[PDB]
Amino acid sequence: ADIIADADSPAKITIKANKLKDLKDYVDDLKTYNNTYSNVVTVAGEDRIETAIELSSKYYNSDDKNAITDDAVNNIVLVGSTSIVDGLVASPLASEKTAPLLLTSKDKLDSSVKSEIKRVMNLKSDTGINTSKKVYLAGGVNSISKDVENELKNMGLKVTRLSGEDRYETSLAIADEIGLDNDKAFVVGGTGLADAMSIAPVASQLKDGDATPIVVVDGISDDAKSFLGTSDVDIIGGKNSVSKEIEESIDSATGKTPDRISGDDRQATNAEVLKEDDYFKDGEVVNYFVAKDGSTKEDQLVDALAAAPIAGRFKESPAPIILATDTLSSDQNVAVSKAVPKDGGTNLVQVGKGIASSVINKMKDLLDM
């Protein structure tokens, strides 16, 4: 009848009940609470630079259950610890190059990120660092200085820099590296970043190892017109960021009438991204990430930068990022409840720890965990 137990198990638990009523109920609650403590986790350091490393530690070159890779990596993407605009365009790049997205200070390469670059590529004095081991620098000398670039070269490493003199053409430089090998391209304005972070985990989703590039327009440059040859475009953000004029500039330059995903609030457009079917299929979203929205301080959207490529490569079902520092909006509340299947969610990842406990608990209830 019974079984021969594992000699290392410390307990023999027997659960009893009169009605298999109450037995089913107790086992059902156990099944969920067991999965909760295993699969609901926080990943944060005590610094934006230090949080980005903890993501790298957990998901790249790791023994973790949900690591993107369990071996060393060849590529790395680097972004200035304050330049949010750059590493938003960079999130697709990190996804296609199978690279972690790390943050550095502009003056000097920080001590911490330097050691993580060694750990994640498995750099050792007894093995030759050959030409496959590379670092991408997303941004100009404005964001990541010439000093830091040379500090990397002197380690014996390859440093390609995608950049320009302004935000509009750096994004072009990054987008040109990313494979524009299919008709999708996301467009965002120089302002309205919290509209744009919502699309970073989507652009990072891969089809045949190809990511979807994003371009930052003014709301077009002639370079962007040639770049966007006959493309279907989705504009993310409101008109405040992308005018209906430049919506037509795209309509004429390509020949394609572009679609727009927008909301009143930054949390509303977050909720709108989730509810788009081309983005996430209805009733099949089990993996979720939570990160600060920047309501209390616009500078905290940096933490969503490093998590976006990991969420878009998570397991085999992609993950959105739910932007919420202090509270969740009703739009996000209903969108999540529609995204989750009947059974519930399987994974919840809190990125950074400026997020109120209320918000995490609301998520747990919506997802039956």
């Binding site: 009848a1 019974d2 079984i3 021969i4 137990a5 594992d6 000699a7 290392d8 198990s9 410390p10 307990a11 023999k12 638990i13 027997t14 659960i15 009893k16 009940a17 009169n18 009605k19 298999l20 109450d22 037995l23 089913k24 107790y26 086992v27 059902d28 609650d29 156990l30 099944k31 609470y33 067991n34 999965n35 909760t36 403590y37 295993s38």
Partner: protein, 313 residues
């Protein structure tokens, strides 16, 4: 994924005693013992356990072999038994057979058939008055059967109860005031048998009953038996003892640890928990048996062995 039985350390004497009793009544032929996965001996009564002295010697050899190992069992250690058994060969002691004999003799005065009235059927005389049935005295078990007074056997081979010797009655079964004569009452030879253990007990629901037949006649039963258990007649059972501790979760108790605090305390194999859940549902809806879900002492139950403790945060 291995069938068997697992004993917590604190219960090892209880379990060992069971194996000893099995050896003494010829149920167990051999037991193969091993410590932490390595064979260290085998207990087997001499000459198929024909002699009580040899069976008692095997019982002692078992305790002597394992007691210090089990009492000193630490984290990670384990003792495995392989029990070869056959319930048919079970025998009974002098005290056991004489204890059944007394409970059988209490049925001596029990009534099998009552006397008939004009309105209900029962015992009626075999001869009539005015061509119409009259009543007779009730039928005792002592009238149809003679239960033995003593038992038969020895300590080596076991003891036995002879089947009560069958007798006849010339009285009949019918209604008082009927023209038609009463119908005959005879013993059922296929419902009276001797008792000597052999993995069976006395079936008191079917023993010493009168059973009316389709044609209207009555057959009586004597000593009827039934299986002591529904487990297979023969085979080899694995039994393990570990250093684990036993925890009882009664959800109907006044106080009991909630499912939340259980996942707080231990980590469980996800496949094992869902396999239990699914087993409950298939029983609740479709009536499907499952080894995972059992009904013991009027309570359905499942058994989990968690991977280990959950690390603090």
């Amino acid at each position: 994924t291995t069938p068997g039985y697992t004993v917590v350390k604190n219960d090892w004497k209880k379990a060992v005693k069971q194996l000893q009793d099995g050896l003494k009544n010829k149920t167990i032929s051999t037991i193969k013992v091993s410590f932490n996965g390595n064979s260290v001996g085998e207990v087997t009564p001499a000459s198929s356990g024909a002699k009580k002295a040899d069976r008692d010697a095997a019982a002692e050899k078992l305790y002597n072999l394992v007691n210090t190992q089990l009492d000193k069992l630490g984290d990670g250690d384990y003792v495995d038994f392989e029990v070869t058994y056959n319930l048919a060969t079970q025998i009974i002691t002098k005290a056991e057979a004489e204890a059944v004999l007394t409970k059988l003799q209490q049925y001596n005065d029990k009534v099998l058939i009552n006397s008939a009235t004009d309105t209900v059927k029962g015992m009626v005389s075999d001869t009539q008055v005015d061509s119409k049935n009259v009543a007779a005295n009730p039928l005792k078990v002592s009238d149809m059967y003679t239960i033995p007074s003593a038992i038969t056997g020895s300590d080596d081979s076991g003891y036995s109860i002879a089947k009560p010797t069958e007798k006849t009655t010339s009285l009949l079964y019918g209604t008082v005031g009927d023209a038609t004569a009463g119908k005959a009452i005879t013993v059922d030879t296929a419902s009276n048998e001797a008792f000597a253990g052999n993995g069976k007990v006395i079936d008191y629901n079917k023993s010493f009953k009168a059973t009316v037949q389709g044609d209207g006649t009555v057959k009586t039963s004597g000593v009827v038996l039934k299986d002591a258990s529904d487990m297979a007649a023969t085979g080899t059972i694995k039994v393990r003892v570990t250093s684990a501790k036993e925890e009882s979760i009664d959800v109907d108790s006044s106080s009991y640890i909630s499912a939340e605090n259980l996942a707080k305390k231990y980590v469980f194999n996800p496949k094992e928990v869902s396999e239990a859940y699914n087993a409950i549902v298939a029983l609740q809806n479709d009536g499907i048996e499952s080894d995972l879900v059992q009904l013991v002492n009027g309570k359905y139950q499942v058994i989990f062995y968690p991977e280990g403790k959950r690390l603090e945060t």
